[PDB]
């Protein structure tokens, strides 16, 4: 018997291919209006999510209003005909454990949210109206244009944004690739008013022309059955109208013949040295089952023995290299080889590029390698079989984007599984990588003064020249270079995926399975995810890692040099799903090893061994010290609000060496001094570790003792004493005091501010007071301070936690001066007092449930669980059951409890107000009533400030 | 003229730099008297010396004259209020003490200068009509017993008495002088002796005016002083007592050529060589014994010590004449021993007799004696002005030995060379007269004798005549040579004129990233001396126990290295001290300014280019090891104060931590350590004395330059110059930390009531309260309840915080002591409310005199300033401002402060207690009920659970 067509559904897909470890259920379908849909049923999930991706972006901006797609994307959050309250959507999510975001690329506008699983339909309904009846309210439009402006101002002095638009500006000016996608106040308000454009109409016109159901893909993830998810999506999206808009295509490359063989010289904001080599290529998107571009990126970008980078690095010319295909749009793509440049490298760019074309020539000479393709296919297959389970919010968003590019039944696999070996396509692409098609850009402060052009949106200073034909000919004549050998088989490829059975003595949280002078070992056998992976986390404590700027510098360089020398060896492991991280900390060193457990012990032993028997190469020492010197200086160019947060940490921590102190001490770091420092640092240690995943208790102990034994044999390590295991305490602010610390950001023309209302040590009581209060003001502060007052793009509120202490913080980056932002934050706090008093007991209990859902949201993947435990461990609070305990307590809080808290600790008149503010001034630097504020005490000297105040205790361990 | 004065001495010879006025006189009753007029002194003083002591104890009552000395403090026929003397002194900014030696009992006090007569009157009655109250007698016997108890396990007292016990048992020299409850009560009771009768008998028989000397210092004219001393003291009855003599020496020939092996308490290795010698006191004008001690005890090139040290056998040596009594003396050569030295005692002594033999061969050297004469002369001329209390007590002791006109000079000014006397004494220093004692734990379990009074385990044996003979045949040893002419003798005594912009207080005259230089030209004392004070701050001096050990060993090794060179300087009045601190290094050079720059450059120069001698490094490391272990044998109240300091300070390494880290100090590790330590520094200095501002900058510059040139020093960052904070105790908290002393069978306790950060008001609340409870605390906890010999109350200052503290060492449990102190605090609460307004004002005045007392010598002023500098408070005018504020305090202010900070129910009471249990450890005013104490098990946890105070703000 033939079935019964639902008329709202053009078709239902066949089985969506998924990993056999993936327990979510899936159904694809196409609505009658052409919307492509993936439904994801996951009855376990605590949060539900949905995303919609429209296949229109800023490449289809009207030529006379740069940034319109982007601006429209902001305006859709601000109210619809069915839900006309400007913040209904944001407010609804915030009160039901939810959040949302959206972004505009060249061909896509992508909207997404998550929310408590009980409130999917309510969230989805408010969401759907975005695509049916936006208000584009005239007042809202006049305000939100500032957020977009503020967003662009954030980027103006950022080198990656400048370089991104400079590339767009050096191609064909008549090509949509050359448009400026962000927009700003000039392009979205100023000029349109000069020109008599009515921007609200332009918004309605763009929404109506391009927000067509036939360019739309939606993904919905919830607890509901696939059948119920289907009815829900049909109900809500069937009415999007189908205007059968053709999908924009860009078959002509933005780089035509007069844009090839060009050389660009560019002045950075930071002191950086980069070389960017670009070739235009055809659109490879449709070859996704062979991926010729990624084959060549894998080789040209390889970092192992025989590689291009390996030789460029041996020559002292480059330290990092990125190679492979770069996205463009439907119709064109790029192929890049970007490196950073040592001082010598900047003088040998021509040779660097010759070496690139010699490596490319080696690939031509050998021809395509099925075995290489086979490794890529095998590693991808394994990565997909054992893929970590994603957070729903990011997952709906990602999948909505790629429903445009693949058949329903392959949306999950298309980007992972390779199927076809295509030596023809590999040769096709390789043939485009030739000197006659190359574009070259050099970024260096050394061009400062010698430029004669100005990119118009960012101000970038640059010069353009034709590459001399004799240079082109010398590159065309690259003969083979014996240093370049293809990679050999990857012996880090894992093969043992067995999941060890759960030991009888296994525990729901990490157990302390070893407690000695040398080492404290926390262990948990994974009992949730059952993927063949493990995480190994080691905190090494030494007093000599941070005792003085000089030692801090030496701890940094030791680990940078170590990673630098392990890099060729560890790259094979990286490719094979096994990675590691090694940083210095204010207490010693941090070492993390993650991925397939199979060959982890081999890599870990290689790392510890190399630590304990370090052999510094002087050439690397000089190069890496020079790069570190630049890195310290380049901090001057970070965002104002980043500066604000950095200064706060300095002020409120017992010991903290500043960038300038570090920088001044760096000149006295000599190779001999560093050689002496390493054994001193390794001579005494404490090791605290978390080992968590597909490993037994015996393996964990063996792993821990192997790290121990290696340090003992080669570095003669002995334990530290317990009295040496100290931690930095937080400055304890005086009741109702208010300190202000002011600095200037000499690069960005915005200001930044962080405001910290210190409350008390962490404890069940105090944590949940602060967290519940932060939940209640979260949406209001964003809606007041950004959406309505438009103080800036970056507006943030929430708990601050450090050294066992806590408080409430606001962070804002703005065009206005810090003193103004203070009064506006104080004005906002006052209003919240009445708001909480007047809140019904039902509303109060609603915010409690929001917070409870967020705090009890179980982690989806092993790494998320490890990070939770690791936080409990390095905080030395060891409170692994914290969520149940604190939520249980939260559920007993009353709004009276919260109002007492606010009036004791936060209100402007509170007896126990502890306020410190960092004001970062810009480089050049009705409404509700702001309260009157005391005269602030101005910190001129951090050392005196700390010397003059008490220091908090540390929290008691659990 | 006047019947009460037998004679008035002539001009008392003094130093031309001494502005005090002097008059001597003998009273008709035979009391020798020196009077001292100093119209500037803030405190006046008197002292009385009775030429009777322990040697004259009744043979059946050991310690009577010592016990008598205590009993004199406890009331007289004219002032029968038991604590009248102490109370009068305390309420008038005074203090007092007394000691009993073998032939002297010496009593002294000081007091506010406006109250000399009232103090002296009460004083005089000690020697007219003591009560010897029976009740008081039965209490105070415990203070004496407790005094003996603290000594029992002290190695210096055990050996002191063991020498006496190995001489002639029939000789007074063998008497047990301290006494204890057994000899002063238990045995006299079982033998039927009335101790009170015996005290009265002893006092009547020997406290005779003919044996007394009296010294009085005050602002009054010499005439008024003469009238006051006549009034109070001519009353003393003269019984014409013969001065006891001891002509026969306690060591006869059966006590010679003897060898003693002694087991110590601490881990120490010592060799004591003793010779009997005739009494040399009458030869004091030529001083043969001191001439010989100067040479035998010399530490410079060619000396006896120098060769013993380079053979790796000995580290320190002491030589010269040792007092005994009228009739007998000793000559000693004492060394400590290395592990090798312990195995070579025979040869160590041979080397001794070789050096003695060379002195015989060369014969006496007048140029040596002439050098001593001339140095002593300079030392006397520029002698620092003494504090009254110590000066009167010193003089009263020597008035018995020298004529009045020469009493100030007799101990300094040598007369003519007497080589015959030197050859006579030297003739006694022969193997056939020697006594040898070795102290080493290696004799543990190898001894067969027990000294009665202290329990010391030892063995005695005769030195074999084959060994005597080898020593008698000691050849001359080329390694021994007389000292060379002292090149450090000062010769420029010019007092530089006060620059026109000199300061009353030190001035910050240099302030760079590397140096803070505080300078003041001396404007009070005008002696040709200077004090030079340097703090070298470095984070690596104390970052961990290994680095603290290495800072210590570095400075010990450096001093060990400099010693031969610096001994000449020390002999010429030019000395230095160099010691590691928790922030870095401290260097002090003091003395005659003439040659100072030579010594200072040498020191800074050896610091920056030091080359460790491996044999020294091993020897000093082993000694440091023993030093850390030997802390176990310190006294309970010392252990108490050490634990408290550990508990209340941010960072502090314990002896076990230092001792364990020590095995990891290798010679290579130490060599790498020093350049690291020196690589970055900050120098804060006080230069104070006979120097100009330009000279000061020059000295600072030479220091900086020497470090920069040789150690490449560079400045520290301001943010690295951090100082440790004090643990901040919670309101209404009570913490207790308990430890055992494994060696002493007493217990100790420190009780700390932390109040608040230092500040004018909090400082003077605490100091006024201290001043008000000082005497009542001593009288209640010692005199009346007799909790023990050591009882102390007062302020505690550390790291800018302060509080009130009680220290007691007792036989009673630490918790019993707690309740008795708590009881005492309650009774003090009543006393303070009952106190009259005139009493309260007396206490304000007493504290004001104490605080405003001006320094008498450069070093004392220097130290006042240095305290402002290292404490980073820089409050050079503190005393005036703080006393000004003190005077406005009211009795109700102090009551409010007590009930807020100190009372058992105070809301801001902050109490921590250290309880040190004795080795074998497990009516009266009512003690309050006490909270349950929080018991500290782990200092780290304890400190990682409390806040830390701020640091105090500098003044400017
Ligand atoms: O720039 C972009 C990203 C934009 C997208 C956007 C644009 C306009 C909006 C207007 C009102 C609400 N959301 C909006 C979001 N974006 C994302 C965020 C992050 N959200 C918060 O921090 C936040 C926190 C707590 C809240 F209660 C809350 F409502 C927000 N901020 N801006 N795309 O081009
Ligand atoms: O032992 C010794 C030394 C003895 C001498 C001695 C013996 C018995 C005494 C009885 C009552 C009063 N003084 C006495 C003194 N001594 C010295 C000290 C030090 N004085 C204080 O600490 C103190 C502090 C504040 C006061 F108000 C106060 F009165 C005393 N304690 N004992 N000689 O043999
Ligand atoms: Zn945006
Ligand atoms: Zn005594």
Curated annotation (Swiss-Prot), chain A:
Alphabetical UniProt keywords: Allosteric enzyme, ATP-binding, Cell membrane, Cytoplasm, Host cell receptor for virus entry, Host-virus interaction, Hydrolase, Membrane, Metal-binding, Metalloprotease, Nucleotide-binding, Protease, Receptor, Secreted, Zinc
Effect in UniProt of substituting residue 458 to A: Strongly reduced enzyme activity
PTM annotation, UniProt: The N-terminus is blocked.
InterPro entries, alphabetized: Metalloenz_LuxS/M16, Pept_M16_N, Pept_M16_Zn_BS, Peptidase_M16, Peptidase_M16_C, Peptidase_M16_M, PqqF-like_C_4
Enzyme class: hydrolase
Recorded catalytic activity of this chain's protein: Degradation of insulin, glucagon and other polypeptides. No action on proteins
Any one Gene Ontology cellular component term annotated for this protein: peroxisome
Active site: 73
Cellular compartments annotated: Cytoplasm, Cytosol; Cell membrane; Secreted
EC number: 3.4.24.56
Binding site for Zn(2+): 70, 74, 151
Known outcome of mutating residue 793 to F: No effect on catalytic activity
Residues that coordinate or bind ATP: 391, 857-863
Regulation: Activated by small peptides. Activated by ATP and GTP, and to a lesser extent by CTP, TTP and PPPi. Inhibited by bacitracin. In vitro modification of Cys residues impairs enzyme activity.
Pfam families associated with the record: Peptidase_M16, Peptidase_M16_C, Peptidase_M16_M, PqqF-like_C_4
UniProt short sequence motif SlyX motif, positions renumbered to this chain: 815-820
GO biological process: amyloid-beta clearance; amyloid-beta clearance by cellular catabolic process; amyloid-beta metabolic process; antigen processing and presentation of endogenous peptide antigen via MHC class I; bradykinin catabolic process; hormone catabolic process; insulin catabolic process; insulin metabolic process
Family under the similarity heading: Belongs to the peptidase M16 family.
Role, per record: Plays a role in the cellular breakdown of insulin, APP peptides, IAPP peptides, natriuretic peptides, glucagon, bradykinin, kallidin, and other peptides, and thereby plays a role in intercellular peptide signaling. Substrate binding induces important conformation changes, making it possible to bind and degrade larger substrates, such as insulin. Contributes to the regulation of peptide hormone signaling cascades and regulation of blood glucose homeostasis via its role in the degradation of insulin, glucagon and IAPP. (Microbial infection) The membrane-associated isoform acts as an entry receptor for varicella-zoster virus (VZV).
Domain commentary: The SlyX motif may be involved in the non-conventional secretion of the protein.
Note: ATP-binding induces a conformation change.
Subunit: Homodimer. Can also form homotetramers.
Name of protein: Insulin-degrading enzyme
Organism: Homo sapiens (Human)
Gene designation per UniProt: IDE
């Amino acid at each position: 018997g033939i079935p019964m067509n639902n008329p709202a559904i053009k078709r239902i897909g066949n089985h969506i291919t998924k990993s056999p470890e993936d327990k979510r259920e899936y159904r694809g379908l196409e609505l009658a209006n052409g919307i492509k849909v993936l439904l994801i049923s996951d009855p376990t999930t605590d949060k539900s999510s949905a995303a919609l991706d429209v296949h229109i972006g800023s490449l289809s901006d009207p030529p006379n209003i740069a940034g319109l797609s982007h601006f429209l994307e902001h305006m859709l959050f601000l109210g619809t005909k069915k839900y006309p309250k400007e913040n209904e959507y944001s407010q609804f999510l915030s009160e039901h454990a939810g959040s949302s975001n959206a972004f505009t690329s060249g061909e896509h506008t992508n909207y997404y949210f998550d929310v408590s699983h009980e409130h999917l339909e309510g969230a989805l309904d408010r969401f759907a109206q975005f695509f049916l009846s936006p208000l584009f309210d005239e007042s809202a439009k006049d305000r939100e244009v500032n957020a977009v402006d503020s967003e662009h101002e954030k980027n103006v002095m950022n080198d990656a944004w400048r370089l991104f638009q400079l590339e767009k500006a050096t191609g064909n000016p008549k090509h949509p690739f050359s448009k400026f996608g962000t927009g700003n106040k000039y392009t979205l308000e100023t000029r349109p008013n000069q020109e008599g454009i009515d921007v609200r109409q332009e918004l309605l016109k763009f929404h109506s022309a391009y927000y067509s159901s036939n360019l739309m893909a939606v993904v919905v993830l919830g607890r509901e059955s696939l059948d119920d998810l289907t009815n829900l999506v049909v109900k809500l999206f069937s009415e999007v109208e189908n205007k059968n808009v053709p999908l924009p295509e860009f078959p002509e490359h933005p780089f035509q013949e007069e844009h090839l063989k060009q050389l660009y010289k560019i002045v950075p904001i930071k002191d950086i040295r980069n070389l960017y080599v670009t070739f235009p290529i055809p659109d490879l998107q449709k070859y996704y089952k062979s991926n010729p571009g990624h084959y060549l990126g894998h080789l040209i970008g390889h970092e192992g023995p025989g590689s291009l980078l390996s030789e460029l690095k041996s020559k002292g010319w480059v330290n990092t290299l990125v190679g492979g295909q770069k996205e463009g749009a439907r119709g064109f793509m790029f192929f890049i080889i970007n490196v950073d440049l040592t001082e010598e490298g900047l003088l040998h760019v021509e040779d660097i590029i010759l070496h690139m074309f010699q490596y490319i020539q080696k690939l031509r000479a050998e021809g395509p390698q099925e075995w290489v393709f086979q490794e890529l296919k095998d590693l991808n297959a394994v990565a997909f079989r054992f893929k970590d389970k994603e957070r729903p919010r990011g997952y709906t968003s990602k999948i909505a984007g790629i429903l445009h590019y693949y058949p329903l039944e392959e949306v999950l696999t298309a980007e992972y599984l390779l199927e076809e070996f295509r030596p023809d396509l590999i040769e096709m692409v390789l043939d485009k990588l030739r000197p006659e098609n190359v574009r070259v850009a050099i970024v260096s402060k050394s061009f400062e003064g010698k430029t004669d052009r100005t990119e118009e949106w960012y101000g970038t200073q640059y010069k353009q020249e034709a590459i001399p034909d004799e240079v082109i000919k010398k590159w065309q004549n690259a003969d083979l270079n014996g240093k370049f050998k293809l990679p050999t088989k990857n012996e880090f490829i894992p093969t043992n995926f067995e999941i060890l059975p759960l030991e009888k003595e296994a525990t729901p949280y990490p157990a302390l399975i070893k407690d000695t002078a040398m080492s404290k070992l926390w262990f948990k056998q994974d009992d949730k995810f059952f993927l063949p992976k493990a995480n190994l986390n080691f905190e090494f404590f030494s007093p000599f890692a941070y005792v003085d700027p000089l030692h801090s510098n030496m701890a940094y360089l030791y680990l940078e040099l170590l990673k630098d020398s392990l890099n060729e060896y560890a790259y094979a492991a990286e490719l094979a799903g096994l990675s590691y991280d090694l940083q210095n900390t204010i207490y010693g060193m941090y070492l993390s090893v993650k991925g397939y457990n199979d060959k982890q012990p081999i890599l870990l032993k290689k790392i510890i061994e190399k630590m304990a028997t370090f052999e510094i190469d002087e050439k690397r020492f000089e190069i890496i010290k020079e790069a570190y010197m630049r890195s310290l200086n380049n901090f001057r160019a970070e965002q104002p609000h980043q500066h604000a947060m950095y200064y706060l940490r300095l002020l409120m921590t017992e010991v903290a060496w500043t960038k300038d102190e570090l920088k001044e001490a760096l000149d006295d770091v000599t190779l001999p001094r560093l050689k002496a420092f390493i054994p001193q640092l390794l001579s005494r240690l404490h090791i605290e570790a978390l080992l968590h995943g597909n490993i037994t208790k015996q393996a964990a102990l063996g792993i821990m003792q192997m790290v121990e034994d290696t340090l003992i044999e080669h570095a003669h390590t002995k334990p530290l004493l317990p009295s040496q295991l100290v931690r930095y305490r937080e400055v304890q602010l005086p009741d109702r005091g208010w300190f202000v610390y002011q600095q200037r950001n000499e690069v960005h023309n915005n200001s930044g501010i962080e405001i910290y209302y210190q409350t008390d040590m962490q404890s069940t009581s105090e944590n949940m007071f602060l967290e519940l209060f932060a939940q209640i003001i979260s949406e209001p502060a964003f809606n007041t301070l950004r959406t309505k007052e438009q103080l800036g793009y970056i507006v943030f509120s929430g708990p601050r936690r450090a050294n066992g202490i806590q408080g409430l913080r606001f962070i804002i980056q703005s065009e206005k001066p810090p003193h103004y932002l203070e009064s506006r934050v104080e004005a906002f706090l006052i209003t919240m007092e009445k708001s909480i008093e007047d809140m019904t007991e039902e509303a109060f209990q609603k915010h409690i449930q929001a917070l409870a859902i967020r705090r009890l949201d179980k982690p989806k993947k092993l790494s998320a669980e490890s990070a939770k435990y690791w936080g409990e461990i390095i905080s030395q609070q060891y409170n692994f059951d914290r969520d149940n305990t604190e939520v249980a307590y939260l559920k007993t809080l009353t709004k009276e409890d919260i109002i007492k808290f606010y009036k004791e600790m936060l209100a402007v008149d509170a007896p126990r107000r502890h306020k410190v503010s960092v004001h970062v001034l810009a480089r050049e630097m009705n409404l509700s009533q702001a309260p009157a504020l005391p005269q602030p005490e101005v910190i001129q000297n951090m050392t005196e400030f700390k010397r003059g105040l008490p220091l908090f205790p540390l929290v008691k361990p659990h």
